[PDB]
Design a protein around this motif. Structure first.
Motif, PDB file in Angstrom:
ATOM      1  N   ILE A  18       0.932  -1.097   0.075  1.00  0.00           N
ATOM      2  CA  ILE A  18      -0.260   0.031   0.041  1.00  0.00           C
ATOM      3  C   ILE A  18       1.065   1.190   0.070  1.00  0.00           C
ATOM      4  CG2 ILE A  18      -1.677   1.348   1.382  1.00  0.00           C
ATOM      5  CD1 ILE A  18      -2.905  -1.218   2.217  1.00  0.00           C
ATOM      6  N   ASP A  19       1.917   1.081   0.718  1.00  0.00           N
ATOM      7  CA  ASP A  19       2.810   2.345   0.871  1.00  0.00           C
ATOM      8  C   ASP A  19       3.635   2.734  -0.771  1.00  0.00           C
ATOM      9  OD1 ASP A  19       3.002   3.743   3.606  1.00  0.00           O
ATOM     10  OD2 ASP A  19       3.252   1.790   4.178  1.00  0.00           O
ATOM     11  N   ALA A  20       4.058   1.504  -1.149  1.00  0.00           N
ATOM     12  CA  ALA A  20       4.506   1.708  -2.138  1.00  0.00           C
ATOM     13  C   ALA A  20       3.563   2.127  -3.423  1.00  0.00           C
ATOM     14  CB  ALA A  20       5.153   0.149  -2.676  1.00  0.00           C
ATOM     15  N   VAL A  21       2.317   1.829  -3.509  1.00  0.00           N
ATOM     16  CA  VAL A  21       1.467   2.137  -4.349  1.00  0.00           C
ATOM     17  C   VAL A  21       1.446   3.694  -4.240  1.00  0.00           C
ATOM     18  CG1 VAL A  21      -0.981   2.074  -5.337  1.00  0.00           C
ATOM     19  CG2 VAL A  21       0.219   0.041  -4.976  1.00  0.00           C
ATOM     20  N   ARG A  22       0.979   4.240  -2.943  1.00  0.00           N
ATOM     21  CA  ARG A  22       0.938   5.450  -2.588  1.00  0.00           C
ATOM     22  C   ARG A  22       1.950   6.427  -2.937  1.00  0.00           C
ATOM     23  NH1 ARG A  22      -3.345   6.924   1.118  1.00  0.00           N
ATOM     24  NH2 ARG A  22      -1.803   8.476   2.028  1.00  0.00           N
ATOM     25  N   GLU A  23       3.203   6.063  -2.996  1.00  0.00           N
ATOM     26  CA  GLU A  23       4.317   6.674  -3.184  1.00  0.00           C
ATOM     27  C   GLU A  23       4.635   7.146  -4.463  1.00  0.00           C
ATOM     28  OE1 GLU A  23       6.451   8.454  -1.504  1.00  0.00           O
ATOM     29  OE2 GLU A  23       5.044   7.839   0.108  1.00  0.00           O
ATOM     30  N   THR A  24       3.851   6.211  -5.519  1.00  0.00           N
ATOM     31  CA  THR A  24       3.714   6.646  -6.958  1.00  0.00           C
ATOM     32  C   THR A  24       3.341   8.151  -7.152  1.00  0.00           C
ATOM     33  OG1 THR A  24       4.016   4.118  -7.362  1.00  0.00           O
ATOM     34  CG2 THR A  24       3.093   5.767  -9.212  1.00  0.00           C
ATOM     35  N   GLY A  25       1.978   8.203  -6.747  1.00  0.00           N
ATOM     36  CA  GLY A  25       1.135   9.551  -6.713  1.00  0.00           C
ATOM     37  C   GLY A  25       0.344   9.666  -8.107  1.00  0.00           C
ATOM     38  N   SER A  26       0.370   8.406  -9.030  1.00  0.00           N
ATOM     39  CA  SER A  26      -0.433   8.279 -10.140  1.00  0.00           C
ATOM     40  C   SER A  26      -1.192   7.151 -10.088  1.00  0.00           C
ATOM     41  CB  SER A  26       0.431   8.566 -11.462  1.00  0.00           C
ATOM     42  OG  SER A  26       0.922   7.458 -11.923  1.00  0.00           O
ATOM     43  N   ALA A  27      -1.357   6.175  -9.246  1.00  0.00           N
ATOM     44  CA  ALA A  27      -1.733   4.755  -9.288  1.00  0.00           C
ATOM     45  C   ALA A  27      -3.142   5.104  -8.208  1.00  0.00           C
ATOM     46  CB  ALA A  27      -0.959   3.727  -9.004  1.00  0.00           C
ATOM     47  N   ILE A  28      -4.022   3.942  -8.374  1.00  0.00           N
ATOM     48  CA  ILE A  28      -4.970   3.793  -7.306  1.00  0.00           C
ATOM     49  C   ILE A  28      -4.867   2.394  -6.501  1.00  0.00           C
ATOM     50  CG2 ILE A  28      -7.628   3.621  -7.181  1.00  0.00           C
ATOM     51  CD1 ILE A  28      -7.914   5.025  -9.965  1.00  0.00           C
ATOM     52  N   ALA A  29      -5.087   2.352  -5.297  1.00  0.00           N
ATOM     53  CA  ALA A  29      -4.887   1.079  -4.386  1.00  0.00           C
ATOM     54  C   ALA A  29      -6.459   0.880  -4.146  1.00  0.00           C
ATOM     55  CB  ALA A  29      -4.126   1.598  -3.337  1.00  0.00           C
ATOM     56  N   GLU A  30      -6.753  -0.548  -4.424  1.00  0.00           N
ATOM     57  CA  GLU A  30      -7.924  -1.204  -4.125  1.00  0.00           C
ATOM     58  C   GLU A  30      -7.695  -2.210  -3.297  1.00  0.00           C
ATOM     59  OE1 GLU A  30     -10.570  -1.849  -7.476  1.00  0.00           O
ATOM     60  OE2 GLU A  30     -11.420  -3.819  -6.330  1.00  0.00           O
ATOM     61  N   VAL A  31      -8.013  -2.109  -1.694  1.00  0.00           N
ATOM     62  CA  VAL A  31      -7.730  -2.965  -0.816  1.00  0.00           C
ATOM     63  C   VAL A  31      -8.889  -4.135  -0.578  1.00  0.00           C
ATOM     64  CG1 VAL A  31      -7.182  -3.580   1.727  1.00  0.00           C
ATOM     65  CG2 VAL A  31      -6.146  -1.824   0.216  1.00  0.00           C
ATOM     66  N   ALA A  32      -8.745  -5.171  -0.742  1.00  0.00           N
ATOM     67  CA  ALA A  32      -9.977  -6.174  -0.796  1.00  0.00           C
ATOM     68  C   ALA A  32     -10.103  -7.163   0.340  1.00  0.00           C
ATOM     69  CB  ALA A  32      -9.850  -6.989  -2.015  1.00  0.00           C
ATOM     70  N   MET A  33     -11.104  -7.549   1.067  1.00  0.00           N
ATOM     71  CA  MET A  33     -11.398  -8.201   2.116  1.00  0.00           C
ATOM     72  C   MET A  33     -12.108  -9.393   1.662  1.00  0.00           C
ATOM     73  SD  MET A  33     -14.444  -5.787   3.754  1.00  0.00           S
ATOM     74  CE  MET A  33     -13.023  -5.381   4.887  1.00  0.00           C
ATOM     75  N   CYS A  34     -11.516 -10.738   2.128  1.00  0.00           N
ATOM     76  CA  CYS A  34     -12.099 -11.963   1.676  1.00  0.00           C
ATOM     77  C   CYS A  34     -13.295 -12.328   2.357  1.00  0.00           C
ATOM     78  CB  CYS A  34     -10.928 -13.056   1.745  1.00  0.00           C
ATOM     79  SG  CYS A  34      -9.594 -12.885   0.317  1.00  0.00           S
ATOM     80  N   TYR A  35     -14.088 -12.843   1.538  1.00  0.00           N
ATOM     81  CA  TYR A  35     -15.521 -13.416   2.294  1.00  0.00           C
ATOM     82  C   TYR A  35     -15.824 -14.773   2.153  1.00  0.00           C
ATOM     83  CZ  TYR A  35     -20.536 -13.644   2.964  1.00  0.00           C
ATOM     84  OH  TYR A  35     -21.904 -13.968   3.445  1.00  0.00           O
ATOM     85  N   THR A  36     -15.934 -15.368   3.159  1.00  0.00           N
ATOM     86  CA  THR A  36     -16.187 -16.653   3.500  1.00  0.00           C
ATOM     87  C   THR A  36     -17.322 -16.642   4.464  1.00  0.00           C
ATOM     88  OG1 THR A  36     -15.301 -18.869   4.061  1.00  0.00           O
ATOM     89  CG2 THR A  36     -14.558 -16.679   5.446  1.00  0.00           C
TER      90      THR A  36
END
Ligand SMILES: CC(=O)SCCNC(=O)CCNC(=O)[C@H](O)C(C)(C)COP(=O)(O)OP(=O)(O)OC[C@H]1O[C@@H](n2cnc3c(N)ncnc32)[C@H](O)[C@@H]1OP(=O)(O)O
Ligand SMILES: Nc1ncnc2c1ncn2[C@@H]1O[C@H](COP(=O)(O)OP(=O)(O)O)[C@@H](O)[C@H]1O
Ligand SMILES: [Zn+2]
Ligand SMILES: [Zn+2]
Lengths: 380, 665, 190
Positions: free
Chosen positions: B271-289
């Motif tokens: 997440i930090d690496a994605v946010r450091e770029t400044g031109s990308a989107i980070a989508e965090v997913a939660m697994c459902y069971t």
């Protein structure tokens, strides 16, 4: 020089142009129809592109706009016609001038002078050459007879658009002149769409003499001596000949001199040729002037050892005949030469072409042998 | 060539007005000449003809003193001969038997002017507003953004992830020019990297570049897996950061980040690496069971997901997503979860699900009626069964409503025949199920694994009866205490069911004598604790004391300084270093294959998998304006050796190729 | 009552809500005990179904039966939109013989209403326990297999009942043009 050049032609002339361009360090671009994807010239170029629709392969090469668009897309700077196809069509020159692409040819104005015929003749009376009687082009038979009532017979009735030896008849009198003229008019209308036929005095036992002219932009004209094409079959050229034997030096000198005077007067800027007919007593008739390069130039290339296509390309780039070394005190023929062409025509059943697959090819060579154009085993 | 006399082939004489003209003519002559079949001294002559001293005429007996004239190398770099060799080898030694008439999918593409520039889409908007503005716009937009998963997640679950780049690159322009309203396209990551390196001998980065150039107006999405980017083991932080940097540089717009066992500190560096770029989107997913709407669900309840989402939001997430990999999300569960998530927080919600039980579109309809902003969809010919819900159904379910997507339905329907023909081409690699199965509610298994499970149980013993594997997967899941599996913890349970069925352990006696079995090493590595901690808890109060007295854990070697040096610069060197550092053996095989047979990624599926047939002509594009026309003529029966001669046609010229027939030995 | 077209479309000037409403009024005048809607091609969408079921339940006092096919895929959503508005009964085919041109699966229908006020009361384990027999029976009938590869989007243009499409595919395999099946689609449209 030019960064890139596009060749809008097919066959051995395209390969010759490619070789000349590679000798000069110029890139090459080729265009082919779908039906001619197996030709050799496609794989001899740096880049190749497909033109035309799925039908009419011949009409694909006769499309100025498509070729201009392809050249613009490929970043070309010049277009080389070759011989045949759109080698003498003024629309190509006009379209080239309308864009940033240069045209390898004499000029746009010179191309208009050579098409309708007999205004060449008007230019030859002005330039002061030996010229023959010229008849008024007319498709009417009564008018042609009213002009024919004062002629030295026999008479050749020739199609106006006819070129090469297609559509002329020799009539020894005027009684059979009207039927002959009607047949010639019908044949010309069916062939080229112009029903007009013109008469001409029929010179006995002629010999055909070609004079080659080379000229640059600012104006300087040189000649590369004469040729001989007397051996013809049904008025079609068959066998080429070295400088013409049994010709005195005064004759050749004055042929070269008035040919060069006509070329200088006409405002030429490229390569080309002038044609003459010589009779038993000897006279010059100035049949016409071809403003392009033929398939026989190699013959003169073997006597004057001067490159024609590369010099043409350098002339189109804006060079005079001074840095090229083509000045007229070191040009002298030495030796004789001749050229022949091999076709698939059968001398047994008529002379129609035969189609098939080649099952064996063995070439030749050695001392004093040059070959242009080469197929491969298994070709169709 | 006869090994008795001299090696003289041809004498070439060139003449001219002067020496420079003769030298230019000789250069042209020696360039035009072509001899293939034996090794020739042409390059030495070309090097000698290109010497400025030789052109100047300073010739001397000691002209050869200059050294680099000899070893000029660069003989021919002949691509046609290597392509022909590979094609003949495939034709003679094709493992697949006889076949019907050849199918050409390219004939099914609709007519469209591929000359005009495509209209602006989501990439323009993302460039103009940035990540935060894009997220705000998506939250405030009444339309529901559709994502396409045909390029990655469709053929992974149906065709064993064996679709090459030719078809995707051929069909991308039409997608970009008839559908300029798609939110994003998923075409990279997951298992495509390993399969491309191993089975298809291709470079994934070239595929990404080709897809980027093909579609310039639609965002691209990639499925990252936390610490283990595309592999199956944790990797150091520097490798992950370099990989994110290279991927965003090549054109990856959106990163979807998940983890097997849902826990923070396993996805923070990504997440930090994605946010450091400044031109990308980070989508965090939660697994459902599981099923939270059930009264007796005491582990996977609403509060668990709510605190998970609160932690994800605290961690700096740009988009929040829910990942359903087995199809266990029901309409009411989805309604309540989406409502709670939308009311507690202020983030857009992305929904992803599979259609294993059938009719999962209802869940989508219950989600976008409560706040869901975006959904996923697979194309109709490659939808259903273990794949994602159809795109046409999704577009038609919102037409003439306030939730209208804006996608033309005729445009989406016009591309189906190409997908049908492509699926018909990939016949030997078919692994789809007969239809919908109800049993998934008891033996919940991800859709991408079920096909390989069916093939494994066909080919490794018991195939007439498949139940035993189902209740064995159930028993293995119950032994470890309700594990959350997607990729990592799915294979361990699969291997455990495999061993259980192969060892006669009915359901429970494995937990009685663990030390008397051949437990797969993935299971011991799970028990060691390098994948994290289970959500419910450790299932070993009596299973094993620490490890059941097996041994210790293997060390890890530190990266060599040159690799850290090469990881800091951007270029093909970094890509090669990542390829070698991630999958050494298959990338080494790929390098050997590429050395042997040049570049074969431009071939079609038919030529690549089957070979050459008689009467057909193939066009292969090498460069812009450089195309090759290949055909076949005849084949001879093998001599006393195993060697055959195949006569082929290249550019209208006959070529004999000597090949080895491994069938007769 | 047979359902065709899409009434929720602004340009639907023939098969509109009023047409179905007068049809149902006539049926009720005729002495009907149950009123049902027959969808044979799978052309009923969630919103159409919601509005139609609501109007029928509010105008009249008869139970409503819903029947549909799963040709486009994912038709269970329609069911979920219907029973949320008044629908009393639905149809279902068993999972091994469901999907494609058949009716929606029974397990999905039972699981979509579990632990809700619309609970059917059917055990899910009991329904799941009978699937292997249906699988074996379908494996026995191998020579007479006529199912489609999967879900098709094109049915919205060339609307054909699910029971006929299989025989159409076999007829176009066995009676000439089989490599290209489009011509039959736009010919049925024409
Ligand atoms: C003056 C002249 O005509 S010759 C001067 C030299 N250049 C040419 O011949 C022009 C076109 N030739 C080429 O492209 C040659 O490949 C060269 C000389 C430029 C380079 O050759 P190499 O580096 O040895 O091989 P390369 O990797 O390019 O192999 C390309 C193959 O595609 C063929 N090819 C090259 N250009 C084209 C084209 N435009 N269209 C179709 N096929 C082509 C080549 O014939 C060759 O097949 P081959 O094994 O029969 O030679
Ligand atoms: N009376 C004539 N005068 C000139 N040429 C004639 C005459 N009769 C026949 N010919 C033939 O007509 C041709 C004249 O050349 P032309 O038709 O312009 O062809 P090209 O343009 O190819 O040189 C030659 O083949 C020549 O032999
Ligand atoms: Zn998935
Ligand atoms: Zn029915």
């Amino acid at each position: 020089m030019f960064s890139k050049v596009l060749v809008a032609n097919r066959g051995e002339i395209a390969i010759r142009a490619f070789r000349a361009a590679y000798e000069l360090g110029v890139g090459t671009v080729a265009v082919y129809p779908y039906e001619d994807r197996n030709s050799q010239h496609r794989l001899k170029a740096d880049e190749s592109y497909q033109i035309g629709d799925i039908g009419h392969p011949v009409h694909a090469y006769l499309s100025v706009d498509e070729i201009v668009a392809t050249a613009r897309r490929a970043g070309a700077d010049a277009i080389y016609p070759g011989y045949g196809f759109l080698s003498e069509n003024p629309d190509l020159a006009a379209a080239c001038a309308a864009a940033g692409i240069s045209f390898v040819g004499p000029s746009a104005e010179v191309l208009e002078l050579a098409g309708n015929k007999s205004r060449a003749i008007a230019a030859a009376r002005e330039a002061g050459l030996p010229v023959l009687m010229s008849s008024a082009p007319s498709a009417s038979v009564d008018e042609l007879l009213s002009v024919a009532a004062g002629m030295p017979f026999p008479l050749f009735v020739k199609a106006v658009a006819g070129g090469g030896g297609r559509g002329m008849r020799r009539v020894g009198d005027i009684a059979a002149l009207p039927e002959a003229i009607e047949a010639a008019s019908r044949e010309a209308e069916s062939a080229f769409g112009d029903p007009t036929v013109y008469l001409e005095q029929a010179v006995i036992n002629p010999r055909h003499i070609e004079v080659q002219i080379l000229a640059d932009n600012l104006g300087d004209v040189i000649h590369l001596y004469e040729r001989d094409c007397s051996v013809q079959r049904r008025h079609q050229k068959v066998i080429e000949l070295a400088p013409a034997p049994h010709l005195d030096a005064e004759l050749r000198y004055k042929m070269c001199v008035d040919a060069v005077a006509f070329a200088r007067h006409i405002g030429y800027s490229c390569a080309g040729t002038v044609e003459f007919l010589l009779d038993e007593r000897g006279e010059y008739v100035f049949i016409e002037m071809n403003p392009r390069v033929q398939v026989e130039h190699t013959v003169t290339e073997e006597i004057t050892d001067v490159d024609l296509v590369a010099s043409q390309l350098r002339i189109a780039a804006g060079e005079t005949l001074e840095q090229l070394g083509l000045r007229q005190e070191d040009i002298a023929p030495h030796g004789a030469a001749l050229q022949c062409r091999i076709t698939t025509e059968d001398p047994a059943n008529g002379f129609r072409p035969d189609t098939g697959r080649i099952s064996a090819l063995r070439t030749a060579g050695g001392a004093g042998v040059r070959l242009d154009g080469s197929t491969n085993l298994g070709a169709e | 060539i006869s090994p008795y006399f001299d090696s003289m082939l041809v004498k070439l004489t060139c003449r001219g007005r002067d020496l420079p003209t003769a030298v230019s003519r000789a250069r042209r002559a020696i360039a035009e000449f072509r001899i293939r079949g034996v090794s020739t001294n042409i390059p030495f002559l070309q090097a000698v003809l290109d010497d400025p001293d030789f052109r100047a005429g300073r010739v001397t007996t000691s002209f050869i003193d200059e050294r680099p004239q000899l070893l000029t190398a660069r003989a021919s770099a002949d691509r046609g001969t290597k392509i022909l060799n590979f094609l003949a080898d495939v034709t003679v030694n094709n493992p697949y038997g006889s076949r019907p008439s050849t199918i050409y999918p390219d004939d099914k593409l609709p007519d469209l002017d591929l000359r005009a520039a495509p209209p602006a889409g989501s990439k323009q908007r993302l460039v103009k507003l940035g990540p935060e503005g894009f997220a705000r716009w998506l939250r405030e937009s009444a339309a529901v953004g559709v994502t396409d998963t045909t390029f990655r997640d469709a053929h992974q679950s149906l065709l064993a992830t064996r679709v090459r780049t030719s078809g995707l690159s051929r069909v991308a322009p039409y997608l970009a020019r008839t559908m300029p309203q798609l939110l994003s396209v998923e075409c990279w990551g997951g298992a495509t990297y390993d399969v491309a390196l191993r089975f298809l001998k291709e470079d994934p980065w070239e595929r990404l570049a080709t897809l980027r150039a093909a579609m310039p107006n639609i965002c691209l999405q990639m499925l990252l897996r936390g610490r283990n980017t595309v592999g199956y083991t944790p990797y150091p932080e520097i490798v992950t950061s370099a990989f994110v940097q290279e991927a965003t540089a090549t054109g990856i717009d959106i990163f979807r980040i998940f983890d097997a066992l849902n826990n923070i500190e396993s996805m923070r560096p990504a997440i930090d690496a994605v946010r450091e770029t400044g031109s990308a989107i980070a989508e965090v997913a939660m697994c459902y069971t599981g099923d939270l709407t059930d009264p007796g669900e005491q582990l996977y309840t609403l509060d668990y997901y709510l605190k998970l989402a609160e932690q994800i939001v605290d961690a700096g997430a740009h988009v929040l997503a829910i990942k359903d990999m087995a199809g266990l999300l029901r309409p009411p569960a989805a309604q309540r979860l989406v409502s709670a998530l939308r009311s507690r927080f202020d983030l857009p919600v992305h929904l992803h699900t599979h259609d294993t039980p059938g009719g999962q579109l209802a869940s989508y309809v219950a989600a976008w009626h409560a706040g869901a902003d975006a959904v996923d969809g697979a194309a109709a010919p490659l939808a259903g069964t273990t794949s994602q819900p159809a795109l046409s159904s999704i577009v038609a379910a919102a037409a003439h409503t306030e939730y209208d997507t804006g996608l033309s339905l005729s445009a989406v329907c016009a591309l189906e025949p190409y997908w049908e023909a492509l699926r018909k081409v990939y016949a030997p690699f078919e692994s789809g199920l007969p239809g919908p199965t109800g049993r998934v509610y008891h033996h919940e298994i991800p859709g991408g694994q079920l096909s390989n499970l069916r093939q494994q149980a066909i080919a490794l013993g018991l195939g007439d009866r498949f139940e035993e594997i189902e209740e064995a997967y159930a028993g293995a899941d119950r032994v470890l205490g309700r594990l959350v599996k997607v990729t990592p913890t799915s294979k361990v349970v699969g291997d455990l069911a495999l061993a259980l069925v192969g060892a006669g352990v009915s359901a429970d006696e494995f937990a009685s004598d663990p030390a008397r079995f051949g437990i797969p090493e993935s299971v011991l590595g799970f028990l060691r604790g390098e994948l994290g901690d289970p959500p419910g808890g450790w299932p070993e109060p009596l299973r094993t004391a620490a490890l059941a007295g097996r041994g210790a854990a293997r060390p890890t070697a530190q990266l060599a300084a040159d690799d850290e040096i090469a990881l800091s610069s951007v270029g093909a060197k970094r890509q090669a270093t990542l390829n070698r550092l991630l999958f050494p053996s298959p990338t080494k095989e790929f390098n050997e294959h590429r050395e042997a047979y040049g570049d074969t990624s431009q071939l079609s599926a038919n030529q690549f998998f089957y070979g050459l047939r008689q009467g057909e002509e193939h066009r292969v594009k090498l460069e812009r304006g450089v195309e090759l026309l290949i055909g076949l003529e005849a084949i001879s029966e093998p001599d006393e050796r195993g060697m055959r001669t195949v006569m082929c046609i290249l550019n209208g010229q006959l070529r004999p190729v000597l090949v080895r027939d491994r069938s007769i030995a």
